[PDB]
Structure formats: C-alpha cells, structure tokens
C-alpha cells in the first residue's frame, strides 16, 4: 500500500545499505589492540566514571580457527582504563566510513549542498553508527557480533541504567525489519536542525518524507496488535538516540581533552581542528 515514490525510496535506501554496510566486517583490518590541580583533576573522576560505565571484553576468531580473548582491567587509578580506546577509535572510524559512503550514495543526500552534507554527517554519524550496531547486537548474550570480532558486556539491572545500552536492548526488542532500520538511518541523517545546516526547509521536507514512508511501511506490513503504535515507538527511540548522541559526544570530548585518541576522521566529525 506504498506509493511508487515510497517503494523507490525504500529500494534506494536498501541499495545504499547493501553496498556500504560490511555486515561481516571482512574489510575491517589493521586495527590496534590493547598492549600485551582541581579543575584539571575533577575531569579525571568524570572520565573514570565515563570509561567504566559499560565495559566490554573482546574476542578475535581467526580465519584458521584460533581465538584470542581480551579481558579488560579494573580501574586501579592509572592509565589502564584507556587500553581499549585505540581499538574503539579504529572500529568507530571504520563504521563512520561506511556511514559516509551510505549518505553520499543516497540521491536525496547527494543533491544537497556540500556544506549541508558535511553538517548532516557531523550531526548524525554517531546515531547511524549505533543504528547499524544494533542489527548485530545479540540481546541474549549481550554481545555485538562483528564478524571475526565480538564485544561482550562484562546483575543486568544496574547495567540497563546506561542510556546507550538501554537503547540497544529496547530497540532490539521491537524486532525491526531491514527496511525499518534503514528508514531510521534516513530520518536521523536528514535531521534539519543539526549545527550548521542551511537548507533547513529542504532537509525538513525530506525527513518528514522518510517518516511518512516508514509510517506507511508499518501500516502495510504489520497488522499485528503487537505492532500498534510501532511507528510512534520508533520515532520516540530516534529522539532518545539523538539525546544519547549528545551525551556521548560530551563524554568523548572529555576523554579526548585528557587522553587524546580520536582518529583524524573522528576529529573531523567532532569539530576538533588540530591546534590547541
Ligand atoms: Cl556501541 C558499541 C559497539 C560495540 C562495542 C562497544 C560499543 C560501545 C561504543 C559506544 C560509542 C561508540 C563506540 C562504541 C558502547 C556500547 C554500549 C554502551 C556503551 C558503549 N563501547 C565503547 C566502549 N565500550 C563500549
Ligand atoms: C562509550 C564512551 C563514550 C563514547 C566514546 C566514543 C564516542 C564516539 C566514538 O566514535 C568512539 C568512542 C569510543 C569511546 C567511547 C567511550 C568509552 C566509555 C564511554 O561511556
């Protein structure tokens, strides 16, 4: 019951997702791994709380059948809390490159002025990265299954207090289709109120249009009473995700000001110029 414009819109989004989402992470290589007064000190207590919010163990399944497993250390007051940051930066950077390739291919995104493209990517790269991570999140084992790589959360009631983490469990519960995930990525990408956007009217009409398509898709393909208000639930999660984005952006910048680790691409997406 979708229009031909709506059907073509989903086809282009799914096409962009298929071409630019390395779901098996087969081309994520050369990444780093952990080794084998008062105003400058109040930061450390906040950075320490940020890093130990959600900790993950890391597993590498080699192509030969071997398995490396990394269990992170506990906070003992030193620099050991930063051990997984270089790897997290490399993985995030790899996801961001796929996100940027995703946007540049969508026709509605390609047609915007280049400055608005950059403004939209700077605003939504983290959110689309989290949306893609949720499709490989295993809520039964609490693990993000990224091909050869697995990231397992180290009861669980105090862990769902982490907002980003409650988001992953709640979004996974909705059991969305691939078409609904990619429509969420489009709605998040075309948020007309990111810092620096000029064509606020063009982006807003495009976003309302991806939302109408998602609303219509759900109405046509989900009559079950369990999917009542599913569209509104999805839109509420996108609002929460945008807020999680702002929280984690400040967490990153706090950690960056004290222990630099952001890659050049991460610096570009987060406004870091390269000079103190
Ligand atoms: Cl999102 C994610 C996927 C896979 C492994 C780890 C994480 C996580 C993260 C958060 C923001 C940007 C990149 C990765 C993360 C997932 C859920 C809740 C918090 C953080 N993470 C970074 C450090 N420890 C865990
Ligand atoms: C997830 C944290 C905030 C967001 C940080 C981030 C944010 C963005 C990004 O591209 C990578 C990372 C890696 C480290 C993350 C942090 C580790 C602990 C903290 O909670």
Q: Is 232 annotated as a binding residue?
A: no
Q: Is 37 annotated as a binding residue?
A: no
Closest CA to 188 of 121, 114, 133: 121
**Ligand 2 in reach of 259 Cβ (< 6 A):** no
Are 105 and 20 contacting, i.e. CB atoms less than 8 angstroms apart? yes
Method underlying the structure: X-ray
Strand, coil or helix: what is 136? coil
**Ligand 2 in reach of 253 Cβ (< 6 A):** no
Q: How many Å lie between the centroid of ligand 2 and the Cα of residue 27?
A: 22
For atom 1 of ligand 1, which residue has the closest CA? 130
DSSP assigned state of 80: G
Q: Is 210 annotated as a binding residue?
A: no
Sequence-distant contacts of 126-130: CB under 8 A, at least 24 apart: 126/245, 126/248, 126/249, 126/269, 127/188, 127/238, 127/241, 127/242, 127/245, 128/99, 128/102, 128/185, 128/188, 128/189, 129/92, 129/95, 129/96, 129/99, 130/164, 130/167, 130/168, 130/241, 130/244, 130/245
Data resolution in angstroms: 2.3
Out of 82, 151, 167, give the residue to mutate to test ligand 1, the one with the largest number of ligand atoms within 8 Å of its CB. Answer: 151
Closest CA to 118 of 92, 94, 131, 100: 100
Q: How many Å lie between the centroid of ligand 2 and the Cα of residue 256?
A: 10
Residues in the chain: 276
CA distance 44 to 40: 7
Alpha helices in 136-229 (DSSP H): 163-173, 178-189, 200-221
CA distance 151 to 78: 23
CA 124: distance to chain centroid?
9
Q: How many Å lie between the centroid of ligand 2 and the Cα of residue 252?
A: 5
CA distance 119 to 112: 11
Domain boundaries, the chain: 1-276
DSSP assigned state of 273: -
With 0-12 CB in 10 A as exposed, 13-18 as middle and 19+ as buried, what is 215? Answer: middle
**Residue 59 backbone dihedrals phi, psi, to 5 degrees:** -130, 135
Alpha helices in the chain (DSSP H): 4-20, 42-51, 85-105, 107-110, 114-135, 163-173, 178-189, 200-221, 230-258, 264-269
Out of 53, 133, 245, give the residue to mutate to test ligand 1, the one with the largest number of ligand atoms within 8 Å of its CB. Answer: 133
């Amino acid at each position: 019951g979708l229009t031909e414009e709506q059907r073509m819109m989903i086809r282009e989004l799914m096409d962009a997702q298929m071409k630019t989402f390395d779901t098996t992470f087969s081309h994520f290589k050369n990444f780093r791994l952990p080794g084998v007064s008062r105003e400058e000190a109040a930061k450390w207590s906040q950075v320490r709380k940020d890093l130990c919010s959600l900790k993950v163990s890391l597993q590498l399944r080699g192509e030969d059948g071997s398995v490396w497993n990394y269990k992170p250390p506990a906070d003992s007051g030193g620099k050991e809390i930063f051990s997984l940051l270089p790897h997290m930066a490399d993985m995030s950077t790899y996801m961001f490159k796929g996100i940027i390739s995703f946007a540049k291919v969508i026709s509605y995104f390609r047609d915007l002025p280049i400055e608005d493209q950059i403004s939209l990517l700077k605003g939504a790269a983290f959110e689309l990265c989290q949306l893609r991570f949720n499709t490989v999140f295993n809520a039964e084992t609490g693990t993000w299954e990224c091909g050869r790589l697995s990231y397992c959360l180290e009861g669980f009631q105090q862990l769902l207090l982490e907002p980003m983490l409650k988001f992953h469990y709640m979004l996974k519960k909705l059991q969305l289709h691939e078409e609904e995930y990619v429509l969420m990525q489009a709605i998040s990408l075309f948020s007309p109120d990111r810092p620096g956007v000029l064509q606020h009217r063009v982006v807003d009409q495009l976003q309302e249009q991806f939302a109408i398509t998602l609303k219509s898709y759900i109405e046509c393909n989900r009559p079950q009473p369990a999917h009542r208000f599913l569209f509104l639930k999805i839109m509420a999660m996108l609002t929460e995700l945008r807020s999680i984005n702002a929280q984690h952006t400040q967490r990153l910048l706090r950690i960056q000001d004290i222990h630099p680790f952001a890659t050049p691409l991460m610096q570009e997406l987060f406004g870091i110029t390269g000079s103190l």
